[PDB]
Enzyme design. Structure first.
Site, mmCIF file in Angstrom:
data_model
loop_
_atom_site.group_PDB
_atom_site.id
_atom_site.type_symbol
_atom_site.label_atom_id
_atom_site.label_comp_id
_atom_site.label_asym_id
_atom_site.label_seq_id
_atom_site.Cartn_x
_atom_site.Cartn_y
_atom_site.Cartn_z
ATOM 1 C CG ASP A 181 -2.299 -0.614 1.008
ATOM 2 O OD1 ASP A 181 -2.539 -1.329 0.010
ATOM 3 O OD2 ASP A 181 -3.175 -0.397 1.887
ATOM 4 C CB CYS A 215 -1.173 1.069 -11.416
ATOM 5 S SG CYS A 215 -0.327 2.552 -12.177
ATOM 6 N NE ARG A 221 1.364 0.410 -6.838
ATOM 7 C CZ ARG A 221 0.385 0.044 -6.012
ATOM 8 N NH1 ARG A 221 -0.460 -0.915 -6.365
ATOM 9 N NH2 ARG A 221 0.248 0.650 -4.833
ATOM 10 C CB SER A 222 1.560 1.661 -15.416
ATOM 11 O OG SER A 222 0.308 1.123 -14.984
ATOM 12 C CD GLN A 262 2.147 7.935 -9.502
ATOM 13 O OE1 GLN A 262 2.030 6.745 -9.189
ATOM 14 N NE2 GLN A 262 1.186 8.808 -9.320
#
Ligand SMILES: CC(=O)Cc1ccc(Cl)c(Cl)c1
Length: 282
Positions: A181, A215, A221-222, A262
């Site tokens: 998370d 994502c 994440r992508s 990010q």
């Protein structure tokens, strides 16, 4: 510089935030006018994450052709990817329309439906064989065929039917279920194992349309997934693998979608994944 020793040099000097801010400063800025039209507000999950006009995927529809999705075309590596946001309640039918129209074989999902107690994307695939889904706005039917649950990821076989023509196709759903998370994984081993399973399926190969990867926003994440894949492919193709420059590859990918990677922690994790992956390849 090479990668593994540039890596230790940034760790010892504690300068990951400065390296990452440089990337943010040099990244491309292209217009995203279609994403910002008022009629598309409920097609965007986040107001600050939009596809560029020049690389956006168009739906084959005359009313409204908009979806928050981008074509990332890597010329030297000879790989293409579609990066998209997690589908919204009012875009699940558009999502599967895109999969159909672009001839994709695989969908890569890097998030859970609920994270941090909030919904990160719609439940857009069926959970039981006998309870199929019909998307009336785009005239598609989607059936769960089989499911294989492993410790770090799940693979599903799905059947997508175009109800207008009665044509059917098999789609593979690759779901990485264990990204934490908060933060990034401590080791890249399970993420790399997952990448190799996607590769082995054929979903990334030129005989199919581009893989669809998402994502929640489709940039973090992508971005890590496609950056690691492309860097490892270039290390196999070139005479000098130490010439592969992960920062330059990331800036090339940011010509096609804003914001890829990010956080500075995601940047460091991408380096770690490519470094460890290059040892296993040989
Ligand atoms: C980028 C990188 O270092 C990967 C790599 C793989 C194999 C060899 Cl033989 C070399 Cl010099 C580099």
């Amino acid at each position: 510089m090479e990668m593994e020793k540039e890596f230790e040099q940034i760790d010892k000097s504690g300068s990951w935030a400065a390296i990452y801010q440089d990337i943010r400063h040099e990244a491309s800025d292209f217009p995203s006018r279609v994403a910002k039209l008022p009629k598309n507000k409920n097609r965007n999950r986040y107001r600050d994450v939009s596809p560029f006009d020049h690389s956006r995927i168009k739906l084959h529809q005359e009313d409204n052709d908009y979806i928050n999705a981008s074509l990332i075309k890597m010329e030297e590596a000879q790989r293409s990817y579609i990066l998209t946001q997690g589908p919204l309640p009012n875009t699940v039918g558009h999502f599967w329309e895109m999969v159909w129209e672009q001839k994709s074989r695989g969908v890569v999902m890097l998030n859970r439906v609920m994270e941090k107690g909030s919904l990160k994307c719609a439940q857009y695939w069926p959970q039981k064989e006998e309870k199929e889904m019909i998307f009336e706005d785009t005239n598609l039917k989607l059936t769960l065929i089989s499911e294989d649950i492993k410790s770090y990821y799940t693979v599903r076989q799905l059947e997508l039917e175009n109800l207008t023509t009665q044509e059917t196709r098999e789609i593979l759903h690759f779901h990485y279920t264990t990204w934490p998370d908060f933060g990034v994984p401590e080791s890249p081993a399970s993420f790399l194992n997952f990448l190799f399973k996607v590769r082995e399926s054929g979903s990334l190969s030129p005989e199919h349309g581009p893989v669809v990867v998402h994502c929640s926003a489709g940039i973090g994440r992508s971005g890590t997934f496609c950056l690691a894949d492309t860097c490892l492919l270039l290390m196999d193709k070139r005479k000098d693998p130490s010439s592969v420059d992960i920062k330059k590859v990331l800036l090339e990918m940011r010509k096609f979608r804003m914001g890829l990677i990010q956080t500075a922690d995601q940047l460091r994790f991408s380096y770690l994944a490519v470094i460890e992956g290059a040892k296993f390849i040989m």
